[PDB]
């Protein structure tokens, strides 16, 4: 049972790590996106066609 248990707990740590890395990715993307919107917001043509 423990032989199975060691792998399971390892997998649990690995799963939280991969998922938290995805969260650290996207949460920081929300922060950078907020940064952009504040850098853009001022009245401007908002470069485009």
């Amino acid at each position: 049972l423990k032989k199975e248990f060691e792998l399971s707990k390892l997998q649990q740590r690995l799963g939280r790590e991969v998922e938290e890395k995805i969260k650290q990715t996207h949460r920081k993307y929300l922060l950078q996106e907020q940064l952009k919107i504040i850098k853009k917001e001022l009245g401007l043509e908002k470069d485009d066609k």
Binding site: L1, K2, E4, F5, S8, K9, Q12
Partner: protein
């Protein structure tokens, strides 16, 4: 083919500390189905 019901089952006469290991067996089984849930828990509640 020859066979005999040699279902060996030696057990200590003194049955005080022999079911104490069982407690660890069920705690490991509860942690395996709690931390890694595979099957239903109704059989365990029965």
């Amino acid at each position: 083919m020859v066979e005999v019901e040699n279902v060996v089952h030696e057990d200590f006469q003194v049955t005080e500390e022999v079911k104490a290991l069982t407690a660890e067996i069920v705690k490991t089984i509860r942690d395996i189905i709690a931390l890694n849930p595979l099957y239903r828990e109704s059989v365990l509640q029965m």
